[PDB]
Amino acid sequence: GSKDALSTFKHTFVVADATKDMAIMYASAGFYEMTQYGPEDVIGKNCRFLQGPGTDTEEVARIRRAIKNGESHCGRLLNYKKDGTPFWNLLTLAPIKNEQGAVVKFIGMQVEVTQFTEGELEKAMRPN
Ligand SMILES: Cc1cc2nc3c(=O)[nH]c(=O)nc-3n(C[C@H](O)[C@H](O)[C@H](O)COP(=O)(O)O)c2cc1C
Numbered sequence: 001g002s003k004d005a006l007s008t009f010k011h012t013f014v015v016a017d018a019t020k021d022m023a024i025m026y027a028s029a030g031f032y033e034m035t036q037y038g039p040e041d042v043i044g045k046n047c048r049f050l051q052g053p054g055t056d057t058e059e060v061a062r063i064r065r066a067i068k069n070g071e072s073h074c075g076r077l078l079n080y081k082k083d084g085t086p087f088w089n090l091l092t093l094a095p096i097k098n099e100q101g102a103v104v105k106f107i108g109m110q111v112e113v114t115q116f117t118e119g120e121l122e123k124a125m126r127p128n
Pocket residue numbers: 014015016022046047048049050051060061063064067077078079089091093106107108109110
């Protein structure tokens with residue numbers, strides 16, 4: 001669920017400033033809760049700091065290329081919370097362009113992968 005109303009009180013995202021080398025300019029409350037990092041470790045930084053051992057170099061290259069090309073993208077990447085816990089991050093990226101069509105910012109929406117249970121599916125599919 002995206003390309004739909006987005007606020008911090010519900011969602012996990014960050015916003016990068018393309019005019020400052022894609023440094024994060026804003027992070028939702030969910031982002032801090034998910035990663036365990038606080039603003040002092042995030043604002044002004046690049047989100048690559050979440051990557052670590054075993055993060056897939058070819059998925060990282062696909063992200064880098066999508067951003068350079070100004071394209072939307074998603075891919076699952078291994079990331080690490082502040083305590084060193086690995087987690088799978090389903091990262092969706094979307095450019096933000098000005099009226100001249102230049103990329104000025106990127107939004108990144110992260111979803112920490114959790115197991116989806118037969119019970120949760122029953123709830124999703126449960127009629128009417
Ligand atoms: C808005 C935005 C959000 C991002 N969020 C994450 C993230 O949650 N985890 C991550 O590993 N990389 C994230 N990235 C990707 C890195 O910032 C970086 O673009 C990627 O590692 C590829 O560039 P590099 O090869 O220079 O590291 C995000 C990028 C952007 C632009």
